[PDB]
Amino acid sequence: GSFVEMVDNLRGKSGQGYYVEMTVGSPPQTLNILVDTGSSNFAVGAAPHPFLHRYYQRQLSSTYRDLRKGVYVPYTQGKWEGELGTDLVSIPHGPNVTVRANIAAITESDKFFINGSNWEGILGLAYAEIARPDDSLEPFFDSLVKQTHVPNLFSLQLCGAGFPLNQSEVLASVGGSMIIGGIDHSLYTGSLWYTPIRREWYYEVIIVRVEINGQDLKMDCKEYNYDKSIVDSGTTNLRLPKKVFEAAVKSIKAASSTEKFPDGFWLGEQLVCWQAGTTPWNIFPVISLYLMGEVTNQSFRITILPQQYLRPVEDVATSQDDCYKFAISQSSTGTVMGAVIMEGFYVVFDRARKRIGFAVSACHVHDEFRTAAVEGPFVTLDMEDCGYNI
Numbered sequence: 001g002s003f004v005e006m007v008d009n010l011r012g013k014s015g016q017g018y019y020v021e022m023t024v025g026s027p028p029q030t031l032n033i034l035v036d037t038g039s040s041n042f043a044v045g046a047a048p049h050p051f052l053h054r055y056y057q058r059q060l061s062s063t064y065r066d067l068r069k070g071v072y073v074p075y076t077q078g079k080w081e082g083e084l085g086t087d088l089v090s091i092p093h094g095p096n097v098t099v100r101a102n103i104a105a106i107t108e109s110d111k112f113f114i115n116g117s118n119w120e121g122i123l124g125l126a127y128a129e130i131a132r133p134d135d136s137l138e139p140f141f142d143s144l145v146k147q148t149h150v151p152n153l154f155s156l157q158l159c160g161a162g163f164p165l166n167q168s169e170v171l172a173s174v175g176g177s178m179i180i181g182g183i184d185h186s187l188y189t190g191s192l193w194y195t196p197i198r199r200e201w202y203y204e205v206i207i208v209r210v211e212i213n214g215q216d217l218k219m220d221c222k223e224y225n226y227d228k229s230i231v232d233s234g235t236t237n238l239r240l241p242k243k244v245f246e247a248a249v250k251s252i253k254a255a256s257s258t259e260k261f262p263d264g265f266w267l268g269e270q271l272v273c274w275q276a277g278t279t280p281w282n283i284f285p286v287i288s289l290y291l292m293g294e295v296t297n298q299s300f301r302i303t304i305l306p307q308q309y310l311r312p313v314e315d316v317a318t319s320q321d322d323c324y325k326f327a328i329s330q331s332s333t334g335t336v337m338g339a340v341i342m343e344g345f346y347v348v349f350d351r352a353r354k355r356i357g358f359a360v361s362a363c364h365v366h367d368e369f370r371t372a373a374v375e376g377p378f379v380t381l382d383m384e385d386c387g388y389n390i
């Protein structure tokens with residue numbers, strides 16, 4: 001590991017997201033910021049809110065600059081309104097540099113901030129194409145690279161605990177690492193395998209084959225990327241296009257048929273519990289996603305375990321049972337490789353070489369019989385045909 005100052009700088013969990021500490025303004029105002037590769041705006045709470053115990057106070061920053069422009073950002077569920085401006089920003093447990101970046105000061109919001117959560121803003125790490133209001137608002141990472149000598153690359157190791165973390169524990173626990181400008185070898189084992197970034201807007205990739213316990217889902221590969229497939233640290237679940245989700249659930253149900261689970265479980269609505277320590281990991285299948293490789297007609301696969309797709313949750317009766325929710329769900333906006341996938345791997349967002357690397361995470365949860373994996377290469381033809389076009 002060559003980046004000790006940044007190792008273990010994240011906190012959180014898949015259900016609440018993972019955040020890094022940042023400072024904004026002069027003198028510096030400390031805030032916890034959600035690390036989100038699924039968006040491109042740096043936005044922070046800038047007004048009192050019931051679920052925030054601190055926020056950005058522009059009037060107390062001598063380096064604050066008003067851009068005199070508002071921004072409205074609506075999401076599937078939730079939305080916020082803010083005022084655009086710039087200020088000096090730093091990451092305490094990050095590169096030792098300070099940069100002037102755009103900041104959306106959130107003044108009004110609805111179902112955005114989460115009661116119980118510990119973050120006060122979001123750091124959109126994706127590209128300008130999807131920034132709001134438009135691509136003219138330079139994203140934080142672009143500013144960082146343009147203003148310093150930090151290499152145009154970052155890597156993320158999200159660490160699921162494998163069990164529930166209570167309010168106090170989740171605040172004291174190490175949730176992972178965000179290495180800005182490099183790759184830390186202590187965070188993974190084995191080799192890194194890279195897939196191309198198809199287009200620079202979201203971190204879009206192309207899935208070319210899917211297997212459930214080695215059995216080919218056997219769908220037209222275009223279905224797996226309809227209408228796109230992205231890597232998003234800001235999404236909890238592994239989300240799959242409707243048809244792919246239906247086929248995957250049918251296969252996962254068949255593989256785990258020795259035990260029957262209620263429809264509510266497969267819908268990700270209700271939890272299932274087992275006596276402490278007896279979770280039947282072995283009856284659930286591993287899931288492999290094959291991704292386009294960097295060499296023509298070559299692909300590689302990343303394999304996750306149920307320890308990744310069954311999200312630990314505290315039981316309603318806070319019993320001693322080990323409980324989980326099914327963390328694979330349907331999407332009408334393409335495949336989303338969320339925390340479920342990311343917790344199994346160290347993921348390298350190599351913007352400089354327009355590629356995303358995957359390696360088995362040194363902190364992935366597993367058992368004595370199976371482990372997550374990243375393996376290759378495999379001969380795969382016409383992978384370009386797997387990509388979707390409107």
Ligand SMILES: CN1C(=N)N[C@](C)(c2cc(-c3cccc(C#N)c3)cs2)CC1=O
Pocket residue numbers: 014015016017018036037038039075076112114122232233234235236339
């Ligand atoms: C999916 N996705 C995204 N990646 N980023 C956006 C900005 C947002 C993510 C969150 C959010 C909140 C809490 C936990 C997690 C988690 N985990 C993500 C709130 S807005 C919009 C969106 O819909």
